[PDB]
Symmetry: C4
Subunit: 93 residues, 4 copies
């Protein structure tokens, strides 16, 4: 419980940072910077944008190595400690 809360806050902050950077350095709209941050950390990849500035490319490299771990951690616990029980409870005859 408190674990998922911590991972949630950590993820929120990680995304906020991405939103602020890509909207300031790469000139994206707040919503687009968020989207790029999300698809990047989850490794989906954005097909409509790639960092154009060397500053953006360097940041993304570091942003990736530092973000993917905690992002998938959240996704992990989000599924295991939240998504799993809900479906099991719905099954119970």
């Amino acid at each position: 419980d408190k674990e998922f809360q911590v991972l949630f806050v950590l993820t929120i902050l990680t995304l906020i940072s991405g939103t602020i950077f890509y909207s300031t350095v790469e000139g994206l709209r707040p919503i687009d910077a968020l989207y790029f941050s999300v698809v990047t950390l989850t490794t989906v990849g954005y097909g409509n944008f790639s960092p154009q500035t060397d500053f953006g490319k360097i940041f993304t490299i570091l942003y990736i190595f530092i973000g993917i771990g905690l992002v998938f951690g959240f996704i992990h616990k989000l599924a295991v400690n939240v998504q799993l029980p809900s479906i099991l409870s719905n099954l119970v005859p």
Copy 2:
């Protein structure tokens, strides 16, 4: 057995939702909306399309966090509890 069935149905529903949304909000053909939903949740990424509407971008963000977990769960059990035995049985001298 019953586990893979549950994960299969859950995945089917998850994809159906994606197909309906992207074909209604993003104006994709049913088959293309399905494809985008699949390549997104499996993190492959679609190189020929990205949500153009802010509504589409927001949904995708949430769709990703909620879908990736169960999708890879299915892929996991699909491989372990289905793909693995089949190949082992084929090996048996």
Copy 3:
């Protein structure tokens, strides 16, 4: 040992199938069809091509669910049962 060999052959066959399909249905060169098959199953994603035919889009969907599992299995054992020992042996004072 024999495990990595099995996973290797399985992966080879999986890629061969992809190479033959994408070069026949999507009209790609043999090398490009292979590349697309590789970047898709490893979830990297191809930024220069997406299936144009409905036949190609349907196949890719199934190809993804069936391929990712064994591909990452190979990558897993390739790293653990092959890449890991080699680096450890190189460390030994």
Copy 4:
């Protein structure tokens, strides 16, 4: 500790190799070759570039199978043995 150091050096070398290849064979700038190497091994995918030469496509295929394992290994230990403790220490009442 010494484990993360080994995985770090291994990753650095893996990326250096990618940077040198893509800047020599694919004619990318050093920073862009590095970026492509990073987004590829982490499976994010690059939406602004794909190998144009058959030499580049073949190398990438092998580069992927050999790199993803150690890259995610680093990301794994980077998160578990470095990122995890730091956040836990920050929590302690």
